[PDB]
């Protein structure tokens, strides 16, 4: 039978290879190009990250929600995949035209010069594979296929490292940039192979179609994807600027390092919510079964993140020695605060994915505004006085009261 634990086991395997391939490539980035190349590729790598969400108009969470909803009805399933295929095709071709025509302005903003126009024109084809690969991974998530999604990410991570090494050893710095963009793009080969071998959907379902009522619903998931790409990231951006003002930019660096390894080890659990929790809650239409599934998920993820966080705290000196440069070994005190906030943030993700599974833009704006407001009140109170440590208390206290409000709002929604 399918459960969150079985999906977490397959997710933990793909996440182990994903962070391992990212650490290997990242270390090769530093040895080959150093801080100078790492600073030039900062805006480019962020573009690749936002392309993983914005290449297919961010409908992937809606694709997973509606594929699971219409997992039985074949006719409506054709219209879900058909409309999703047309939106991914139309948006990525429009993005490719924007990247190929305005290659000079984008290079001017991403690198400061115009010497990277050809790289931007190559991104136009790269983001096409990113959008299509993310779509195929969304369909496999809608059918709760944890093995198909994990195997596609693992194989795509291996050929992504080989492609980076081939492109870097051939084209050099611009080749290493193309390889960094090709790592999320080459997942379309294992995703397509896994899509037709397991036979989850016929290939004719990918033929572009248009359902008006279904295109507007996926458009609501586009608005939600556009909201997360600005709301909380801007809040954090304001936090680093306030920290860099009252203290040093390196004091922002020790807070970024603790949060970086926090994002890696939390991905063992958060990546399984889109494989099991999102499709399961979309099929459930009764509040009795929704309450049972949400409570059952909290019974598993809360001890899981708490055990994983504790072991990270016991190995916090090990992380600073390896994953960090071991430059400011005093950040070991920033761990316990961030790791407690990681536990309560994971618990609140269950209520957040329930909001996604029900396509509630109302409860979505409410959730993002609450986290934005609480993060900003606690940052202005702790950062100017406690430094990077206070930035962790602001992160911990925000999600301590956010999980409490999520529980209270869920209780009022149940009764």
């Amino acid at each position: 039978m399918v459960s969150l634990a079985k999906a977490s086991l397959w997710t933990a395997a793909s996440t182990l290879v994903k962070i391992g391939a990212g650490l290997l490539v990242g270390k090769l980035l530093a040895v080959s190009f150093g801080p100078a190349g790492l600073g030039l590729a900062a805006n480019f790598r962020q573009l690749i990250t936002v392309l993983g969400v914005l290449a297919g108009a961010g409908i992937f969470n809606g694709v997973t929600k509606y594929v699971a909803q219409y997992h039985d009805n074949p006719q409506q399933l054709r219209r879900v995949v058909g409309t999703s295929s047309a939106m991914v095709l139309g948006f990525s071709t429009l993005m490719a035209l924007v990247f190929v025509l305005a290659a000079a302005p984008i290079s001017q903003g991403l690198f400061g010069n115009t010497d990277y126009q050809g790289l931007v024109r190559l991104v136009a084809l790269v983001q096409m594979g990113i959008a299509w690969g993310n779509l195929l991974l969304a369909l496999m998530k809608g059918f709760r296929d944890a093995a198909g999604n994990a195997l596609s990410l693992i194989v795509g991570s291996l050929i992504g490292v080989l492609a980076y090494y081939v492109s870097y050893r051939l084209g050099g710095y611009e080749g290493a940039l193309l390889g960094l963009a090709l790592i999320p793009a080459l997942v379309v080969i294992p995703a397509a192979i896994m899509l037709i071998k397991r036979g989850v959907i016929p290939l004719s379902y990918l033929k572009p179609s248009w359902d008006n009522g279904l295109a507007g619903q996926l458009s609501k998931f586009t608005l939600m994807a556009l909201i997360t790409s600005v709301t909380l990231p801007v809040a954090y951006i304001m936090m680093r600027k306030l920290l860099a003002a009252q203290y040093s930019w390196d004091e922002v660096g020790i807070w970024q390092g603790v949060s970086s390894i926090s994002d890696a080890y939390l991905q063992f659990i958060t990546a399984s919510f889109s494989v099991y929790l999102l499709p399961t809650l979309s099929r459930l239409t009764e509040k009795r079964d929704i309450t049972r599934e949400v409570v059952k998920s909290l019974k598993f993820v809360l001890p899981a993140v708490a055990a994983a966080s504790f072991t990270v705290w016991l190995l916090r000196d090990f992380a600073i020695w390896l994953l960090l440069s071991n430059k400011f070994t005093a950040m070991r005190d920033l761990f316990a605060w961030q790791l407690v906030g990681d536990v309560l943030k994971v618990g609140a993700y269950v209520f957040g994915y329930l909001v996604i599974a029900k396509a509630s833009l109302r409860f979505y704006i409410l959730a993002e505004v609450s986290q934005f407001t609480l993060l900003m009140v606690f940052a202005h109170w702790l950062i100017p006085a406690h430094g990077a440590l206070g930035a962790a208390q602001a992160y911990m206290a925000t999600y301590i009261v956010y999980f409490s409000l999520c529980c209270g709002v869920f209780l009022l929604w149940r009764r």
Partner: nanobody
Amino acid sequence: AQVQLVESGGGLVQAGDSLTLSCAASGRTAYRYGMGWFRQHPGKEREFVASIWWTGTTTYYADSVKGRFTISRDDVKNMVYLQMNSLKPEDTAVYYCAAKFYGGNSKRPGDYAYWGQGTQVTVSS
């Protein structure tokens, strides 16, 4: 508990020469104490020179020592250093090192809890 601060260095140098002071910190969780250097003129109040944040990421300097002074800390040996360059005649004072738990961002001697015995730093114009 606390931390014990033992200063080292100083002496009779010439104007324009260089000198390095060292503050050894002995105690539990010595990495949590922000450290600062203070100097005291004959009978006058204690003045601020330089300091370091308890994480070792932000260094603070006085305007009179902005260009010629440099504070640092080795967290392995738990010792704070003050590299002094281009010694001018106003640098003749007793140089103290102070400590404060989760501190080191203040220019005031009251915001530091643990002090040590100073070193005699005097220049010969």
